[PDB]
Symmetry: D2
Subunit: 243 residues, 4 copies
Amino acid sequence: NFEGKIALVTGASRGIGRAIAETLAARGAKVIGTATSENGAQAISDYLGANGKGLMLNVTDPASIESVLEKIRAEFGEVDILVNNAGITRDNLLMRMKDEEWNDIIETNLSSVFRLSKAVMRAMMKKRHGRIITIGSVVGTMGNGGQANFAAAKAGLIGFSKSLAREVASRGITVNVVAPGFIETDMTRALSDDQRAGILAQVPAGRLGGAQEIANAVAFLASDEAAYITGETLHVNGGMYMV
Amino acid sequence: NFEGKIALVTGASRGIGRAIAETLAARGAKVIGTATSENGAQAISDYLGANGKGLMLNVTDPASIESVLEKIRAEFGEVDILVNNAGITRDNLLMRMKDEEWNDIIETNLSSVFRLSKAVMRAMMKKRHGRIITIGSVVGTMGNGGQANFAAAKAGLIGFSKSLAREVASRGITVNVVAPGFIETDMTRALSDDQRAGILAQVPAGRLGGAQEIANAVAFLASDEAAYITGETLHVNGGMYMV
Amino acid sequence: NFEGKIALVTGASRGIGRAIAETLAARGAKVIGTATSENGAQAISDYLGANGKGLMLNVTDPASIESVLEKIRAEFGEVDILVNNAGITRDNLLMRMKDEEWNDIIETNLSSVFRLSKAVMRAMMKKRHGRIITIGSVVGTMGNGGQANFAAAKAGLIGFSKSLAREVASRGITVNVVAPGFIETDMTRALSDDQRAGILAQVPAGRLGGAQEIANAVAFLASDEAAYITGETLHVNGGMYMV
Amino acid sequence: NFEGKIALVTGASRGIGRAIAETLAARGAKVIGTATSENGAQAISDYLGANGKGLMLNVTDPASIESVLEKIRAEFGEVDILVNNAGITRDNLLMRMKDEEWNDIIETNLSSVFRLSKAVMRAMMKKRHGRIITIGSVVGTMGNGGQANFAAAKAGLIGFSKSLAREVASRGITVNVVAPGFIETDMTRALSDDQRAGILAQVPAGRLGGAQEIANAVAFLASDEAAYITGETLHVNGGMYMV
């Protein structure tokens, strides 16, 4: 139960992001989901209704980051739960990877984690309680051909979280990572029927995971039932990989 | 909420074992906790009340295993959730470790996992649904001086679970491990303040974990909210170790 | 260069075991390879020639273990390098796994590591120098359907080594594990041309590893060039798995 | 023995970098060590003598990267072995970490790995053989208070290497990481005995590691004796951490 808790879920327009936003809201938290346009920010506001609000945010723009937080402190208050789910992909074999494809992935997938975590830390420490959860990926752990940039960022955010976790552990703040395997979303519904089959062959469970399933893991970690879990990575991949 | 689910929690006399038994019961499951003595069984039966029953079980005795399950199928039904929490410790530096101290730890901490998991598998596969959760230990992952035997068994049960997970993943059955760090028990409660400070010194969180906190992790994994998590190890150690 | 060093390589009749025995011998060590029969022990003596000797050993028989070591101390001296490579497989889905198939794998693959390591420890500690290397398997880390017993033992020996490593680290003794992926041996040359292809599909390198390649890793770890490596697991699997 | 092999070791002015440069050179490779200043290049050239040359390089400057490689193809030839050892530290608790301290660490410690690996790939793929080794850190795996930026980059380069490894594995090219623990450098040599005791307290081996010891691990991985090792991380930390 997250009654009275304020959660900021970056990139909450669809799939995992949205399921996270809706699940936290359904369990009592005032949720602020974000998108990169006024349109998307509105759509989020529409589905969250009176439970939260949608705000436009660019996780790579320091200005956008403080601006968004300011509003939040004004209309709702200090952020208690941060869920870093904003991220993108710029797949390509190393040989064909453009410098911009590397830099954007790093800036958006990794650096974003540092900026936002840093931006909500002070308030959490004062209250001596908080939750920071970043949506990683099984790729950050096993790596994947054609995704060296994506993998670097996903692996990197775990290294980041482990270190931050050690800095604020005693202050009642946990920093964890939920690593999804293949989840049914846009990026999987737009794959040919053959690619889809190729994907399922790697998953012992024999089915793609659900966005909601990733949301359930986040909610658990964001709750008070997971206060002794920090610096940990929770893999939700149907057995695709086991650590 | 495990409405209509039957859970068998081995070694449910106290601490982690008991908290697991009570938490599953509080959330709607009919729980069967076990002990080595008729006393314990009865004590377990008293605290579980109408939610479950206590039965005497020796996880190293094939006969006892058969027998206990038999009594469960007769009075309650097929086991849906298995929680392997029975285990012991026979600490000693390798050079002073007795052969019996190695064999007992292996028989009770590792082999037990094979015997019980195997014993509840068929019914689970038929129902095309099930949960197997073993209580490991952070020691299984980082190892520990004077606990080579304990460490072998805890590390070993993860290897076991990973393999079993791959065998029954497609059948709607997950096999996971929850690895506790230092948890407040009767052993630690009776330690001197200096001894306790030497343990706390290792935990970034700055406190021992709570038996209930381990119970919460198990409940999450045992629920339908964790259907896409299998072959995974969930570390609940306050940051003592991060993988 | 292992001039003046004595190495005991268990199960050195073929493949990995033999390549290890020959490589250590070629680099100056007096090698004692073992087998389960007088015949095999002789064959080993024949290929090692003046570099070592073959002895009959049963890693599950405490009597055989001290008996073999005694001779070694009599004809060569104290063991400086221990390479646990003896091991077997009793594959079967959990449902069809016989109690004897579980017990034998554990006794031969895991318990053996404890008995032999314990048996050569005293001398190593006195000399304040030594090397203990156990041949694990990628299966101990990722697990594998139909090999729950094998996986438990391989995972378990890592837990064991980590703990032992912590006990003797300061005494100039390292305890490590080399985890091979699919290696060309009898157990792979006796697979149908289809199973072989299935195996290669999992290996980025696109070829089975060589017994000699596993031997090279062991030699490195057994040398003085790896004195700061302990409690570590070296994966040699062509990219089949990455940790 | 790298007879006829060309190795490029970034940041080879001292410690680990230098030991790597000298060890590869001593074993027959023509080595090109790099520094940020013309001084360093020359100093490197002096100690390498006729075995190699020193060149000024800035791993964050695409121009410098191009340029340096250009000079190497002209005077020596295509790079066969790449050792990414250039890196820096900008320690600080998250709340006091400057944006420049995050960006510089990422640009220099992580992005550099992408730029240089990409820059030597084509020739390696053509030769259907190559070695890429990056010097990580135990911090990338366990994280560390006050080093969130360093940790992110070190963890990130592993994710990168794993993915690249999968892309070029079949082409006879391995991509690995050597993760040193506490290594005796000019920073530690100048610490007070109490500060040194606080580090030694963490190392089971009971001493700092030697720069040469890290060099030995790299040489092993760079040799033909490690052709079946890729996407792997080799921990050389005296037991400070065990994975």
